[PDB]
Amino acid sequence: TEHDQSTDIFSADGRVFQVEYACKAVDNGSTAVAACCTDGVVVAVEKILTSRMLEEGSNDRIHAVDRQAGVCICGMLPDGRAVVSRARAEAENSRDVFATPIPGSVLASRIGEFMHVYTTHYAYRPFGCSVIIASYADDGPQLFVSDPSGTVAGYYGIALGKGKTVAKTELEKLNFKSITCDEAVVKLTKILHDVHDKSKDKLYELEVAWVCNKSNCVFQHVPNDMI
Amino acid sequence: TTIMAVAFKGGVVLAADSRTSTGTYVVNRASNKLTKLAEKIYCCRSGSAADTQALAEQTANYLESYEIDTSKPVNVTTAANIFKKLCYMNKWNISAGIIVAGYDPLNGGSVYSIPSGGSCVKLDYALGGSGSIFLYSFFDANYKTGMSKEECVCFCQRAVAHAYSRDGSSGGLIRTIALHQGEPEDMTIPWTKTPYCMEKDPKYRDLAVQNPPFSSSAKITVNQSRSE
């Protein structure tokens, strides 16, 4: 059992255990849900509060990466943050070098590539976050997840973290051809309030952002009067 | 400068812009580049104003003497040759490009170009000055033989205006003069009645989209006009 100490090593079954373990961080972190709608994308996360004396806006999991794109970090927050800075450099690169807002599929590709590389060198470790990518550039509304392996997949709706198996069951009852950004903000908030465990995490708040036709395709936290 | 002369049946027209410049700054905005050499012979001056004023004055002095001796009006070719020789003898010491044109009863309207270096060429039209290089194609495309006096004045005014709208070193008034068997006719058009400028041409009204707003699309539409 020396085969699980570096991520530069296959196990005998063809697994990379350092990457499995990092995925376990994510699966024990807080629950986030997202929905790709007709007019945009909505993300909602649940912040577990470590203290009643935090200012509001502390330990934000949702960050803007470009005028039209944002990420929600699920898993370890500072790991997630290093991923946010790369995502911004990519987004900036695309405007600087190619004169275009980055497409959502391309930004997700580049984030994956980035997370993948810390899965191959003895000297580094995998990231301990998944990153939800929400975009609305010339390719329309897109929602991608990258994970610690560097796998990237597009979604209509999704849920990560500890609540994720129930949240997934409720996200299945939505209708993704009709639903708008306004309806989703309501429904996703209801799902985070129901999968919340009250025994274990007494202090929480919800964070919620969006990029829609309302917001003039700008990624932004939703105005706090809509929960 | 933009100068030119054009022959028509019976006469010539001479045209010029009105600007004198140091390169970047206009020292006179109302010069008169159509200089009289005899009753029906004029020249259009380009280059150093000091040089072309001195050579025109000198050419005029000689022709007035010659007309008193002969007792006859002087032919254009004589004006042109006197000038040419002055332009050739001093070629290394001056910057001058000249057009001599005129009317005389023996040969009608005639036009001579006398460019830098002092050659002398007898033509149906002549262009000169910095602004000339914008009019070759104009004339190739739009000029015709057989034009009347009135067509030719108008055409000259429109050529000068095309030249001076693109040449930084030309501008101001458009002066013309028409020389023929009758009395000399001069005309001055102010910049506010110019027949062409880019400021009033409708294909340059709408501005290039150099300053689009920060947007979530690669689509280009309008210049940003107000802060966000």
GROMACS .gro file of C-alpha atoms in nm:
model
  455
    1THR     CA    1   0.000   0.000   0.000
    2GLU     CA    2   0.284   0.238  -0.097
    3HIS     CA    3   0.089   0.302  -0.418
    4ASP     CA    4  -0.118   0.587  -0.277
    5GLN     CA    5   0.129   0.850  -0.171
    6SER     CA    6   0.204   1.034  -0.495
    7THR     CA    7  -0.027   1.108  -0.783
    8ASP     CA    8   0.251   1.025  -1.033
    9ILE     CA    9   0.176   0.650  -0.991
   10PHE     CA   10  -0.086   0.409  -1.112
   11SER     CA   11  -0.210   0.149  -0.876
   12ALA     CA   12  -0.220  -0.207  -1.009
   13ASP     CA   13  -0.587  -0.174  -1.110
   14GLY     CA   14  -0.524   0.139  -1.315
   15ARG     CA   15  -0.651   0.385  -1.052
   16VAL     CA   16  -0.487   0.705  -0.930
   17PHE     CA   17  -0.569   0.714  -0.558
   18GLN     CA   18  -0.432   1.058  -0.479
   19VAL     CA   19  -0.701   1.183  -0.718
   20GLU     CA   20  -0.970   0.972  -0.555
   21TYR     CA   21  -0.889   1.116  -0.212
   22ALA     CA   22  -0.900   1.474  -0.331
   23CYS     CA   23  -1.244   1.397  -0.474
   24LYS     CA   24  -1.341   1.294  -0.123
   25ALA     CA   25  -1.273   1.648   0.003
   26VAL     CA   26  -1.533   1.778  -0.246
   27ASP     CA   27  -1.786   1.511  -0.149
   28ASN     CA   28  -1.769   1.615   0.220
   29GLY     CA   29  -1.780   1.991   0.152
   30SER     CA   30  -2.096   2.202   0.135
   31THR     CA   31  -2.377   2.145  -0.122
   32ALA     CA   32  -2.405   2.362  -0.442
   33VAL     CA   33  -2.677   2.344  -0.712
   34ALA     CA   34  -2.696   2.494  -1.063
   35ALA     CA   35  -2.940   2.511  -1.356
   36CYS     CA   36  -2.896   2.605  -1.723
   37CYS     CA   37  -3.210   2.787  -1.832
   38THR     CA   38  -3.355   2.943  -2.146
   39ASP     CA   39  -3.231   3.292  -2.063
   40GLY     CA   40  -2.918   3.221  -1.859
   41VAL     CA   41  -2.753   3.019  -1.583
   42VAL     CA   42  -2.818   3.023  -1.209
   43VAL     CA   43  -2.588   2.890  -0.932
   44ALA     CA   44  -2.663   2.853  -0.562
   45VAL     CA   45  -2.432   2.749  -0.287
   46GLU     CA   46  -2.470   2.692   0.083
   47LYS     CA   47  -2.203   2.853   0.300
   48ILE     CA   48  -2.151   2.673   0.632
   49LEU     CA   49  -2.064   2.953   0.876
   50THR     CA   50  -1.786   2.880   1.124
   51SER     CA   51  -1.885   3.177   1.354
   52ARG     CA   52  -2.175   3.418   1.410
   53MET     CA   53  -1.931   3.710   1.398
   54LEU     CA   54  -1.840   3.695   1.028
   55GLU     CA   55  -1.915   3.997   0.812
   56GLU     CA   56  -2.148   3.913   0.521
   57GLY     CA   57  -1.953   3.834   0.205
   58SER     CA   58  -1.697   3.627   0.393
   59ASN     CA   59  -1.567   3.307   0.232
   60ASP     CA   60  -1.764   3.368  -0.090
   61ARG     CA   61  -1.765   3.061  -0.310
   62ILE     CA   62  -1.884   3.240  -0.626
   63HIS     CA   63  -1.645   3.458  -0.818
   64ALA     CA   64  -1.666   3.646  -1.148
   65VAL     CA   65  -1.405   3.544  -1.401
   66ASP     CA   66  -1.506   3.778  -1.682
   67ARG     CA   67  -1.787   4.016  -1.756
   68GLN     CA   68  -1.997   3.720  -1.872
   69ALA     CA   69  -1.866   3.424  -1.673
   70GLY     CA   70  -1.832   3.301  -1.317
   71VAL     CA   71  -1.732   3.002  -1.104
   72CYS     CA   72  -1.867   2.840  -0.793
   73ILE     CA   73  -1.599   2.658  -0.590
   74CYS     CA   74  -1.715   2.346  -0.406
   75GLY     CA   75  -1.463   2.171  -0.186
   76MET     CA   76  -1.165   2.334  -0.028
   77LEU     CA   77  -1.197   2.711  -0.074
   78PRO     CA   78  -0.830   2.827  -0.112
   79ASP     CA   79  -0.759   2.557  -0.371
   80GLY     CA   80  -1.061   2.682  -0.552
   81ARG     CA   81  -0.921   3.029  -0.545
   82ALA     CA   82  -0.606   2.936  -0.738
   83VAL     CA   83  -0.836   2.798  -1.003
   84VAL     CA   84  -1.023   3.134  -1.013
   85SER     CA   85  -0.704   3.323  -1.084
   86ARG     CA   86  -0.615   3.097  -1.375
   87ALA     CA   87  -0.965   3.122  -1.512
   88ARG     CA   88  -0.935   3.502  -1.510
   89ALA     CA   89  -0.598   3.493  -1.688
   90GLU     CA   90  -0.755   3.273  -1.953
   91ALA     CA   91  -1.052   3.502  -1.988
   92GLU     CA   92  -0.816   3.801  -2.015
   93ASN     CA   93  -0.596   3.623  -2.263
   94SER     CA   94  -0.889   3.566  -2.491
   95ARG     CA   95  -0.978   3.938  -2.494
   96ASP     CA   96  -0.617   4.049  -2.523
   97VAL     CA   97  -0.492   3.809  -2.783
   98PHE     CA   98  -0.803   3.705  -2.977
   99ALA     CA   99  -1.042   4.000  -2.925
  100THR     CA  100  -1.330   3.780  -2.814
  101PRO     CA  101  -1.500   3.707  -2.483
  102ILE     CA  102  -1.395   3.352  -2.405
  103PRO     CA  103  -1.654   3.092  -2.506
  104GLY     CA  104  -1.791   2.894  -2.214
  105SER     CA  105  -1.683   2.557  -2.359
  106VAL     CA  106  -1.332   2.683  -2.410
  107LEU     CA  107  -1.297   2.834  -2.062
  108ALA     CA  108  -1.411   2.502  -1.912
  109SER     CA  109  -1.162   2.314  -2.132
  110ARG     CA  110  -0.877   2.530  -2.007
  111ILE     CA  111  -0.973   2.490  -1.642
  112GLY     CA  112  -0.985   2.113  -1.681
  113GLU     CA  113  -0.645   2.116  -1.851
  114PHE     CA  114  -0.515   2.311  -1.552
  115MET     CA  115  -0.656   2.083  -1.288
  116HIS     CA  116  -0.530   1.785  -1.486
  117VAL     CA  117  -0.170   1.882  -1.471
  118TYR     CA  118  -0.154   1.870  -1.091
  119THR     CA  119  -0.254   1.505  -1.140
  120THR     CA  120   0.065   1.400  -1.311
  121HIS     CA  121   0.376   1.533  -1.131
  122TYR     CA  122   0.527   1.379  -0.819
  123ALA     CA  123   0.593   1.730  -0.674
  124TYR     CA  124   0.228   1.859  -0.665
  125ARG     CA  125  -0.104   1.732  -0.546
  126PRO     CA  126  -0.448   1.738  -0.704
  127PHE     CA  127  -0.681   2.026  -0.618
  128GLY     CA  128  -0.941   1.957  -0.357
  129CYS     CA  129  -1.228   2.141  -0.519
  130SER     CA  130  -1.467   2.104  -0.808
  131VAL     CA  131  -1.542   2.415  -1.010
  132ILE     CA  132  -1.889   2.492  -1.157
  133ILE     CA  133  -1.850   2.719  -1.462
  134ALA     CA  134  -2.144   2.934  -1.566
  135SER     CA  135  -2.116   3.137  -1.881
  136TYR     CA  136  -2.321   3.325  -2.133
  137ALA     CA  137  -2.098   3.440  -2.420
  138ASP     CA  138  -2.160   3.413  -2.799
  139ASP     CA  139  -2.218   3.036  -2.757
  140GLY     CA  140  -2.530   3.093  -2.535
  141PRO     CA  141  -2.596   2.969  -2.172
  142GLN     CA  142  -2.350   2.706  -2.061
  143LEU     CA  143  -2.293   2.518  -1.737
  144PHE     CA  144  -1.981   2.301  -1.696
  145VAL     CA  145  -1.822   2.119  -1.398
  146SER     CA  146  -1.448   2.052  -1.374
  147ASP     CA  147  -1.334   1.813  -1.100
  148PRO     CA  148  -0.996   1.730  -0.934
  149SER     CA  149  -0.922   1.473  -1.206
  150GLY     CA  150  -0.962   1.743  -1.471
  151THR     CA  151  -1.266   1.589  -1.628
  152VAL     CA  152  -1.502   1.848  -1.771
  153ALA     CA  153  -1.864   1.786  -1.856
  154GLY     CA  154  -2.157   2.004  -1.956
  155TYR     CA  155  -2.485   1.990  -1.779
  156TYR     CA  156  -2.841   2.112  -1.778
  157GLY     CA  157  -2.854   2.100  -1.400
  158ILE     CA  158  -2.617   1.972  -1.130
  159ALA     CA  159  -2.546   1.933  -0.758
  160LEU     CA  160  -2.217   1.882  -0.572
  161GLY     CA  161  -2.116   1.813  -0.212
  162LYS     CA  162  -2.271   1.625   0.079
  163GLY     CA  163  -2.635   1.690  -0.006
  164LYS     CA  164  -2.578   1.595  -0.369
  165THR     CA  165  -2.772   1.268  -0.394
  166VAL     CA  166  -3.100   1.414  -0.273
  167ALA     CA  167  -3.051   1.750  -0.452
  168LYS     CA  168  -3.003   1.548  -0.777
  169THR     CA  169  -3.339   1.376  -0.722
  170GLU     CA  170  -3.514   1.718  -0.698
  171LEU     CA  171  -3.327   1.873  -0.991
  172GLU     CA  172  -3.468   1.579  -1.194
  173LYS     CA  173  -3.828   1.702  -1.141
  174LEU     CA  174  -3.754   2.042  -1.309
  175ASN     CA  175  -3.816   2.109  -1.679
  176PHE     CA  176  -3.511   2.247  -1.852
  177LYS     CA  177  -3.675   2.352  -2.180
  178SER     CA  178  -3.913   2.602  -2.013
  179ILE     CA  179  -3.761   2.715  -1.685
  180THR     CA  180  -3.635   3.072  -1.656
  181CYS     CA  181  -3.372   3.238  -1.440
  182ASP     CA  182  -3.643   3.392  -1.219
  183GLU     CA  183  -3.816   3.058  -1.147
  184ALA     CA  184  -3.484   2.876  -1.090
  185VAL     CA  185  -3.366   3.121  -0.822
  186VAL     CA  186  -3.675   3.017  -0.629
  187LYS     CA  187  -3.652   2.640  -0.689
  188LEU     CA  188  -3.280   2.595  -0.627
  189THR     CA  189  -3.308   2.790  -0.302
  190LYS     CA  190  -3.585   2.556  -0.190
  191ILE     CA  191  -3.365   2.253  -0.263
  192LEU     CA  192  -3.070   2.384  -0.063
  193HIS     CA  193  -3.305   2.456   0.232
  194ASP     CA  194  -3.439   2.096   0.228
  195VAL     CA  195  -3.112   1.903   0.191
  196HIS     CA  196  -2.965   2.113   0.474
  197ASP     CA  197  -2.868   1.910   0.784
  198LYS     CA  198  -2.969   2.094   1.102
  199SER     CA  199  -2.801   1.864   1.357
  200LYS     CA  200  -2.451   1.919   1.219
  201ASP     CA  201  -2.432   2.271   1.061
  202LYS     CA  202  -2.638   2.520   1.264
  203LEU     CA  203  -2.510   2.839   1.099
  204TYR     CA  204  -2.539   2.881   0.723
  205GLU     CA  205  -2.630   3.132   0.455
  206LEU     CA  206  -2.707   3.087   0.086
  207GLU     CA  207  -2.509   3.252  -0.189
  208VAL     CA  208  -2.674   3.278  -0.535
  209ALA     CA  209  -2.553   3.424  -0.865
  210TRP     CA  210  -2.656   3.444  -1.225
  211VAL     CA  211  -2.585   3.543  -1.579
  212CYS     CA  212  -2.907   3.607  -1.767
  213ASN     CA  213  -3.064   3.845  -2.026
  214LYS     CA  214  -3.206   4.049  -1.735
  215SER     CA  215  -2.855   4.125  -1.601
  216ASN     CA  216  -2.751   4.228  -1.955
  217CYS     CA  217  -2.543   3.904  -1.968
  218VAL     CA  218  -2.324   4.015  -1.675
  219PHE     CA  219  -2.230   3.755  -1.416
  220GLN     CA  220  -2.330   3.886  -1.075
  221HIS     CA  221  -2.463   3.794  -0.729
  222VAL     CA  222  -2.843   3.813  -0.737
  223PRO     CA  223  -2.989   4.116  -0.549
  224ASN     CA  224  -3.047   4.004  -0.187
  225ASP     CA  225  -3.424   4.078  -0.196
  226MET     CA  226  -3.517   3.762  -0.391
  227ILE     CA  227  -3.484   3.464  -0.153
  228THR     CA  228  -0.046   7.404  -5.284
  229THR     CA  229  -0.276   7.282  -5.556
  230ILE     CA  230  -0.250   7.464  -5.892
  231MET     CA  231  -0.376   7.374  -6.232
  232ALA     CA  232  -0.460   7.510  -6.575
  233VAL     CA  233  -0.691   7.376  -6.838
  234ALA     CA  234  -0.739   7.458  -7.201
  235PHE     CA  235  -1.081   7.508  -7.354
  236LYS     CA  236  -1.176   7.620  -7.699
  237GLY     CA  237  -1.083   7.982  -7.714
  238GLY     CA  238  -0.900   8.014  -7.381
  239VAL     CA  239  -0.768   7.876  -7.059
  240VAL     CA  240  -0.874   7.854  -6.700
  241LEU     CA  241  -0.628   7.880  -6.414
  242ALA     CA  242  -0.721   7.760  -6.061
  243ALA     CA  243  -0.556   7.752  -5.721
  244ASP     CA  244  -0.612   7.698  -5.348
  245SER     CA  245  -0.522   7.985  -5.114
  246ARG     CA  246  -0.294   7.846  -4.850
  247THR     CA  247   0.059   7.927  -4.755
  248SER     CA  248   0.211   7.710  -4.493
  249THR     CA  249   0.530   7.647  -4.290
  250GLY     CA  250   0.463   7.273  -4.290
  251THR     CA  251   0.222   7.245  -4.001
  252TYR     CA  252   0.097   7.594  -3.943
  253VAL     CA  253  -0.080   7.819  -4.189
  254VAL     CA  254   0.090   8.159  -4.216
  255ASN     CA  255  -0.145   8.293  -4.480
  256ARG     CA  256  -0.487   8.158  -4.550
  257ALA     CA  257  -0.570   8.385  -4.840
  258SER     CA  258  -0.271   8.392  -5.076
  259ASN     CA  259  -0.299   8.468  -5.439
  260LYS     CA  260  -0.110   8.210  -5.643
  261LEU     CA  261  -0.252   8.330  -5.972
  262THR     CA  262  -0.006   8.598  -6.073
  263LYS     CA  263  -0.045   8.830  -6.370
  264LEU     CA  264   0.243   8.840  -6.629
  265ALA     CA  265   0.063   9.037  -6.905
  266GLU     CA  266  -0.292   9.137  -6.985
  267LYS     CA  267  -0.382   8.777  -7.087
  268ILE     CA  268  -0.099   8.571  -6.954
  269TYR     CA  269  -0.090   8.445  -6.595
  270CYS     CA  270   0.106   8.198  -6.402
  271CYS     CA  271   0.023   7.964  -6.116
  272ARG     CA  272   0.297   7.956  -5.855
  273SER     CA  273   0.395   7.660  -5.640
  274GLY     CA  274   0.694   7.601  -5.417
  275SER     CA  275   0.887   7.866  -5.228
  276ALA     CA  276   0.679   8.182  -5.234
  277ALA     CA  277   0.992   8.402  -5.215
  278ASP     CA  278   1.139   8.240  -5.531
  279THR     CA  279   0.820   8.233  -5.741
  280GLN     CA  280   0.727   8.592  -5.654
  281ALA     CA  281   1.078   8.705  -5.762
  282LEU     CA  282   1.072   8.504  -6.088
  283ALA     CA  283   0.721   8.614  -6.180
  284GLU     CA  284   0.803   8.978  -6.116
  285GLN     CA  285   1.110   8.942  -6.333
  286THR     CA  286   0.927   8.766  -6.609
  287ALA     CA  287   0.664   9.042  -6.609
  288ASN     CA  288   0.920   9.317  -6.625
  289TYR     CA  289   1.072   9.158  -6.940
  290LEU     CA  290   0.741   9.106  -7.115
  291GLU     CA  291   0.623   9.464  -7.063
  292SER     CA  292   0.948   9.593  -7.222
  293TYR     CA  293   0.909   9.351  -7.511
  294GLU     CA  294   0.549   9.458  -7.573
  295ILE     CA  295   0.649   9.826  -7.590
  296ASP     CA  296   0.925   9.756  -7.842
  297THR     CA  297   0.721   9.529  -8.064
  298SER     CA  298   0.402   9.737  -8.004
  299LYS     CA  299   0.207   9.407  -8.002
  300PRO     CA  300   0.042   9.180  -7.742
  301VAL     CA  301   0.272   8.903  -7.642
  302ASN     CA  302   0.227   8.538  -7.716
  303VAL     CA  303   0.210   8.279  -7.451
  304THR     CA  304   0.514   8.092  -7.580
  305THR     CA  305   0.730   8.398  -7.518
  306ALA     CA  306   0.614   8.417  -7.154
  307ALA     CA  307   0.675   8.053  -7.113
  308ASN     CA  308   1.027   8.065  -7.262
  309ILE     CA  309   1.141   8.363  -7.063
  310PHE     CA  310   1.022   8.202  -6.738
  311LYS     CA  311   1.159   7.857  -6.830
  312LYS     CA  312   1.505   8.004  -6.879
  313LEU     CA  313   1.497   8.174  -6.540
  314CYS     CA  314   1.382   7.846  -6.387
  315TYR     CA  315   1.659   7.652  -6.566
  316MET     CA  316   1.945   7.892  -6.490
  317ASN     CA  317   1.859   7.894  -6.121
  318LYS     CA  318   1.751   7.534  -6.083
  319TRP     CA  319   1.991   7.450  -5.796
  320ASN     CA  320   1.908   7.763  -5.593
  321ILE     CA  321   1.523   7.756  -5.597
  322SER     CA  322   1.218   7.545  -5.523
  323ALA     CA  323   0.965   7.633  -5.796
  324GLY     CA  324   0.695   7.462  -6.000
  325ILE     CA  325   0.521   7.695  -6.247
  326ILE     CA  326   0.234   7.687  -6.492
  327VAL     CA  327   0.214   7.959  -6.753
  328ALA     CA  328  -0.110   7.994  -6.939
  329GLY     CA  329  -0.264   8.252  -7.144
  330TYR     CA  330  -0.456   8.359  -7.448
  331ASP     CA  331  -0.311   8.512  -7.758
  332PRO     CA  332  -0.465   8.557  -8.107
  333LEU     CA  333  -0.205   8.351  -8.297
  334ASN     CA  334  -0.225   8.025  -8.100
  335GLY     CA  335  -0.542   8.067  -7.887
  336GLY     CA  336  -0.530   7.930  -7.530
  337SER     CA  337  -0.210   7.756  -7.422
  338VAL     CA  338  -0.073   7.591  -7.120
  339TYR     CA  339   0.288   7.524  -7.033
  340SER     CA  340   0.410   7.323  -6.737
  341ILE     CA  341   0.747   7.422  -6.605
  342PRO     CA  342   0.836   7.185  -6.321
  343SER     CA  343   1.138   7.169  -6.094
  344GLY     CA  344   1.454   7.135  -6.297
  345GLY     CA  345   1.330   7.382  -6.561
  346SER     CA  346   1.186   7.171  -6.839
  347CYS     CA  347   0.897   7.315  -7.040
  348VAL     CA  348   0.610   7.113  -7.173
  349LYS     CA  349   0.312   7.226  -7.375
  350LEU     CA  350  -0.009   7.057  -7.275
  351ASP     CA  351  -0.388   7.057  -7.273
  352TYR     CA  352  -0.384   7.063  -6.893
  353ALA     CA  353  -0.128   7.088  -6.622
  354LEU     CA  354  -0.127   7.008  -6.252
  355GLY     CA  355   0.121   7.125  -5.994
  356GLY     CA  356   0.200   7.161  -5.625
  357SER     CA  357   0.180   6.901  -5.349
  358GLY     CA  358  -0.191   6.863  -5.406
  359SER     CA  359  -0.140   6.761  -5.770
  360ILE     CA  360  -0.072   6.393  -5.693
  361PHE     CA  361  -0.438   6.357  -5.583
  362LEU     CA  362  -0.576   6.485  -5.916
  363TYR     CA  363  -0.405   6.270  -6.189
  364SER     CA  364  -0.667   5.997  -6.148
  365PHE     CA  365  -0.942   6.255  -6.110
  366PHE     CA  366  -0.857   6.401  -6.448
  367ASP     CA  367  -0.796   6.062  -6.610
  368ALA     CA  368  -1.142   5.950  -6.492
  369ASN     CA  369  -1.350   6.271  -6.519
  370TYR     CA  370  -1.185   6.525  -6.751
  371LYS     CA  371  -1.287   6.560  -7.112
  372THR     CA  372  -1.179   6.765  -7.408
  373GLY     CA  373  -1.430   7.005  -7.569
  374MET     CA  374  -1.544   7.171  -7.243
  375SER     CA  375  -1.681   7.527  -7.263
  376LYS     CA  376  -1.552   7.807  -7.047
  377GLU     CA  377  -1.829   7.749  -6.790
  378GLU     CA  378  -1.775   7.374  -6.776
  379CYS     CA  379  -1.404   7.427  -6.733
  380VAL     CA  380  -1.432   7.683  -6.448
  381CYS     CA  381  -1.667   7.455  -6.265
  382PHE     CA  382  -1.451   7.147  -6.326
  383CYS     CA  383  -1.139   7.330  -6.199
  384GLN     CA  384  -1.322   7.441  -5.884
  385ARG     CA  385  -1.423   7.086  -5.816
  386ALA     CA  386  -1.072   6.947  -5.878
  387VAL     CA  387  -0.910   7.198  -5.646
  388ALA     CA  388  -1.162   7.110  -5.376
  389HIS     CA  389  -1.094   6.739  -5.408
  390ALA     CA  390  -0.724   6.803  -5.381
  391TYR     CA  391  -0.738   7.034  -5.086
  392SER     CA  392  -0.971   6.808  -4.885
  393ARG     CA  393  -0.702   6.541  -4.867
  394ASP     CA  394  -0.384   6.749  -4.885
  395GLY     CA  395  -0.284   6.892  -4.544
  396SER     CA  396  -0.074   7.150  -4.730
  397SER     CA  397  -0.363   7.301  -4.936
  398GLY     CA  398  -0.684   7.465  -4.830
  399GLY     CA  399  -0.879   7.788  -4.792
  400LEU     CA  400  -1.029   7.974  -5.084
  401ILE     CA  401  -1.052   7.852  -5.440
  402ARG     CA  402  -0.944   8.126  -5.686
  403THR     CA  403  -0.991   8.096  -6.058
  404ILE     CA  404  -0.929   8.307  -6.366
  405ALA     CA  405  -1.051   8.261  -6.724
  406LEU     CA  406  -0.855   8.410  -7.010
  407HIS     CA  407  -0.989   8.430  -7.368
  408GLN     CA  408  -1.043   8.695  -7.637
  409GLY     CA  409  -1.277   8.890  -7.402
  410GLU     CA  410  -1.207   9.046  -7.058
  411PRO     CA  411  -1.033   8.845  -6.779
  412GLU     CA  412  -1.279   8.683  -6.538
  413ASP     CA  413  -1.169   8.608  -6.181
  414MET     CA  414  -1.364   8.424  -5.919
  415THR     CA  415  -1.302   8.339  -5.555
  416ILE     CA  416  -1.503   8.066  -5.377
  417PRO     CA  417  -1.500   8.067  -4.990
  418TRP     CA  418  -1.444   7.743  -4.805
  419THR     CA  419  -1.807   7.757  -4.682
  420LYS     CA  420  -1.932   7.720  -5.043
  421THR     CA  421  -1.672   7.465  -5.157
  422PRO     CA  422  -1.820   7.209  -5.396
  423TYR     CA  423  -1.659   6.921  -5.208
  424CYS     CA  424  -1.538   6.848  -4.862
  425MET     CA  425  -1.514   6.534  -4.654
  426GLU     CA  426  -1.690   6.718  -4.366
  427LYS     CA  427  -2.010   6.740  -4.573
  428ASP     CA  428  -1.981   6.416  -4.772
  429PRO     CA  429  -2.245   6.170  -4.640
  430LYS     CA  430  -2.026   5.860  -4.665
  431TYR     CA  431  -1.805   6.006  -4.391
  432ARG     CA  432  -2.083   6.116  -4.157
  433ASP     CA  433  -2.106   5.803  -3.936
  434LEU     CA  434  -1.797   5.740  -3.725
  435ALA     CA  435  -1.575   5.434  -3.737
  436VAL     CA  436  -1.633   5.192  -3.458
  437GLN     CA  437  -1.300   5.219  -3.282
  438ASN     CA  438  -1.439   5.246  -2.929
  439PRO     CA  439  -1.698   4.973  -2.864
  440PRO     CA  440  -1.819   4.920  -2.505
  441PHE     CA  441  -1.698   4.642  -2.284
  442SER     CA  442  -1.941   4.363  -2.373
  443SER     CA  443  -2.025   4.000  -2.331
  444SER     CA  444  -2.032   3.946  -2.716
  445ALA     CA  445  -1.779   3.979  -2.996
  446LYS     CA  446  -2.048   4.160  -3.194
  447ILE     CA  447  -1.958   4.518  -3.287
  448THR     CA  448  -2.233   4.777  -3.311
  449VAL     CA  449  -2.167   5.134  -3.195
  450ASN     CA  450  -1.905   5.350  -3.027
  451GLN     CA  451  -1.951   5.390  -2.652
  452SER     CA  452  -2.087   5.747  -2.598
  453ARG     CA  453  -2.146   5.757  -2.217
  454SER     CA  454  -1.972   5.618  -1.911
  455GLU     CA  455  -2.107   5.300  -1.755
   0.00000   0.00000   0.00000
